[PDB]
Design a protein around this ligand. Sequence first.
Ligand code: MG
Ligand code: MG
Ligand code: MG
Ligand code: MG
Ligand code: MG
Ligand code: MG
Ligand code: MG
Ligand code: MG
Ligand code: MG
Ligand code: MG
Ligand code: MG
Ligand code: MG
Ligand code: MG
Ligand code: MG
Lengths: 220, 239, 106, 53, 103, 62
Amino acid sequence: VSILGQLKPSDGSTKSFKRLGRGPSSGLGKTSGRGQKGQKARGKVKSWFEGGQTPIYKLFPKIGFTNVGAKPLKELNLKRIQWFHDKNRLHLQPGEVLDMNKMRKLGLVTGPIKYGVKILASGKFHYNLPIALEASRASAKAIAAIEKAGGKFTARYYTPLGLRAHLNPQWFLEKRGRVPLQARPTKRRDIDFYSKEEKRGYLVMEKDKLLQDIKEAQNK
Amino acid sequence: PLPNAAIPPKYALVTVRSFPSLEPLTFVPVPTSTVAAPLRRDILWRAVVYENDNRRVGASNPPGRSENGFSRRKLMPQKGSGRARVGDANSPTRHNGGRALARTAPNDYTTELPSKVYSMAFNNALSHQYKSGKLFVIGGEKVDLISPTPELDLNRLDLIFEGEVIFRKFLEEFQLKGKRLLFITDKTREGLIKSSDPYKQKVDVIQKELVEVNDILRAQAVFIELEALEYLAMAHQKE
Amino acid sequence: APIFPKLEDVKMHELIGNNNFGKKTYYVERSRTGNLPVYSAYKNGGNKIITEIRKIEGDVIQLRNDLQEQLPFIPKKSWSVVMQSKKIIIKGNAVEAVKRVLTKKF
Amino acid sequence: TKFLQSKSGYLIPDYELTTLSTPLQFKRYIKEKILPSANDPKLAYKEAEPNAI
Amino acid sequence: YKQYFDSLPLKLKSFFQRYPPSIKYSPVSTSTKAINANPFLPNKHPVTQRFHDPKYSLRRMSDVYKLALRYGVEEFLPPIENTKKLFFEEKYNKKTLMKGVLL
Amino acid sequence: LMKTHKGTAKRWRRTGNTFKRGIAGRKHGNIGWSHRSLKALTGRKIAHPAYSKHLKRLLPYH
RNA sequence: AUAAUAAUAAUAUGGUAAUAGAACAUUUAAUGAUAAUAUAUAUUAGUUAUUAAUUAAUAUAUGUAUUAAUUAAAUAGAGAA
RNA sequence: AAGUAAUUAAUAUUAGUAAAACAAUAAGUUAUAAAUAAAUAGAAUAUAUAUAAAAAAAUAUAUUAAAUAUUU
RNA sequence: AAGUAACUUAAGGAUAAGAAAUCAACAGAGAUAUUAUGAGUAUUGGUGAGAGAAAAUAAUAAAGGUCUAAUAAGUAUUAUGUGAAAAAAAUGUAAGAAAAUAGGAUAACAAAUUCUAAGACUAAAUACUAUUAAUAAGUAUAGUAAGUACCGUAAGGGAA
Ligand SMILES: [Mg+2]
Ligand SMILES: [Mg+2]
Ligand SMILES: [Mg+2]
Ligand SMILES: [Mg+2]
Ligand SMILES: [Mg+2]
Ligand SMILES: [Mg+2]
Ligand SMILES: [Mg+2]
Ligand SMILES: [Mg+2]
Ligand SMILES: [Mg+2]
Ligand SMILES: [Mg+2]
Ligand SMILES: [Mg+2]
Ligand SMILES: [Mg+2]
Ligand SMILES: [Mg+2]
Ligand SMILES: [Mg+2]
């Protein structure tokens, strides 16, 4: 009558599981795939035990360290952007700057963004979009490509919280009718990076107050 | 080029009716994806099985040698007895003892399924039902009716108490006495449920949001509100 | 916008059995993003490399034949169609070619 | 279609309605399907055994 | 206007109930038994010169201030200035960068 | 749940499919040996297939 | 360009530890006709390349299958403690 | 009267979706870029390029990316 | 293994916790409780066996804030002996501060942030029992008898 009593899974989906210790002809009879009489045959021995020879872990020297101050950026290639543009899934007349937030909205950069996005030149030879771009940084080649295109890149700084705010300030608004303002850089290295002209940083391209303040301090 | 590259038919007509009898009022065009999907029984199987798994109670709780009542005393000394060696009286080897590899308290049989797949399965079920001709849609207020809704009968999917009698009459008319039926309703039509409860064994009455693939598949004839149907379609859309 | 349009909106050739779609014709739906459902796959531990044409409505066999006609340099015996899910698997990594063949029609 | 149903006594499945695009076609369908069961009652379609012969 | 007031958050309302704007609370620390004594400041008791811990623990006070800011009603609270807590835009403006940043 | 063997993690690091490790043998007792020879004992090295399985089991999240 | 069955030619078909593939019995859940001329279990004699099922006779129940089949699962198979 | 369950990891097969997937309250997980101990470094037939040691820049070693089109 | 078993003491329908001398990072949050993620990440270990956070975002939750201290030294802190495998807060022994112009918080110092110890109350989510209702790919050797017969001096064991 009903289809309910005649449903099968797709061919290749399911196998029979191997039934041990259930008679000899089955194939996994008495010893049930264990062989004879070892430690293995009954007790548990850690799979990676080495017999007592110094193990692969214990032999070699331990190396390096994890930089906890490190912030790995999501990479995003010019090529991808170009592809998106070609498709027509890239709407930028409303918002003239393609910021990280904008990218994420588009799909452009997918998954979660923790620290920020680095732009990279994969399809620089075929890139030609006169666009304002913003990200956490970009490779020199990428920058060059952008400039050739008649585009405009600047590299901004975002702390985690700041970045989060940028990505979706709507949430923030919903929460406490406000968006948290952008933190200044404080780590010296970060400051240096944003000062650098070649990196195309937002401290010198916007002529920020912070730099000026620093200069003043130095003077006095 | 590629010859034979046609464009597919995107709609399908489902005749809206009036639930005490079933007099056709209008045709409504519903999309092909929710009512004329090709029958992919494997997808259906994935859904149904999943549903069953989630429905399990899982109360198999035999006593293991830990939970079994006996003491930990070694019943007989290791040697000197001339008998086989014995431990505590909880070993599964002995008749009174625990069970080996016991299953314990609430057994969890729940499984996952991608939402999209589930939606597809639902759609497929509906399509199957429609193909069978055992899908019947009931409605009125929302769409323009070609033929005017008759008097003494409404489009709400609702009704000694008289209602029960009416229901019985309907059943008699439609040759579906013994067979199981499924009423998919937009809201709690209490009256309808009351009417049906004499025939509870063969009648499912389900709120929109809680309808299951199994329930549709099980049912020999389904009666659904137009609004409810629309909602379902929206839920299991595609995008 | 609406899930069900009004009866007046729908035309006669948009319903089932009025296109003659079942008789030897087919249609390949594009993905959500709007790309051709042709994909590379690396099976059996990255060792074999196949291509897979997916979202096909109608007669897959006919489609396969048409594809073969279009691009004959891929041998005939390396075209494996599965009927349960209606998708056609090609032995090599010839995705680009397939895409090229496709786009021009739909 | 409604008229046909009413006069006939047997209601047609919505799928059929959707498909068939002419009165002649409808008639043919009816002849194929519902006529034989009307004449011979034990030749009818019991749902419990769909593969019945 | 009354309706609007009612609509406001609960904590703020509660605060208003016991510390209304009708009275002007002193900016600087005071006697603990004066009626213009600021809840947010550590006031001192006359008998036994012991600074009482603020009638509003700092966190709570901060929260209240934030709430006020959100609905514009900053001025109807007593003044915070003598607690070293500043908020949002003003804080950003008036912040002397750290010795480590400047040099 | 299952967890990384921290010792192994400290020694080994994930590079694409395989793992890399520091050559053993360079810590001391180096003098008298030719510096061109000891060049080989510096640098990283890739995991032998024999032991890849073990490594995988050791560090299931790398 | 498939499947099922049947041909022709060829090659292959011992097997412990072990690997791989395919079935059957039992019990439970989902779907489910039917019927005392029916069913279930048992004994005997048949039948089908047969751990199984079926046929006939016989005996005992029982107003009658969780029955055929497809899934899901297992306290799923015992001369070896 | 004896290979079971829970929480994980890796491989395979099939299904769904697919340059994205799951979840879609927001997060997050994996994929989308390789490399390095780490750092402000990072992709046009290869002989071009990327990262590491080296360096003015190449070479040299390792791994990677890169071939009227439709991204992995 | 493990602050687990065990022994001992004391309270309640629940107990504990709880309105920051907290977290954080120069932008911020805003009591506890414990679940997802974060994360088997940081941290740590005869650097073996192995152990392993927090911020943050989500749920669950209730009106969740609110004075009952004339605002707190032998207290903070230091030295020394102990002390939740990672994160302190505790504690025996002696030394022993300061008034918001002041304290605490980070190996250390300088900046800057943040909180106010040595006084307090607190529903809800939670644990366990008992009853009722529902659902059982649960049990008739997990289906009511009996803690009986019987065994042991006893604790205790324990049938059909
Ligand atoms: Mg064997
Ligand atoms: Mg041996
Ligand atoms: Mg043996
Ligand atoms: Mg062995
Ligand atoms: Mg053999
Ligand atoms: Mg058994
Ligand atoms: Mg036996
Ligand atoms: Mg035997
Ligand atoms: Mg309490
Ligand atoms: Mg208390
Ligand atoms: Mg522990
Ligand atoms: Mg004090
Ligand atoms: Mg206090
Ligand atoms: Mg006695």
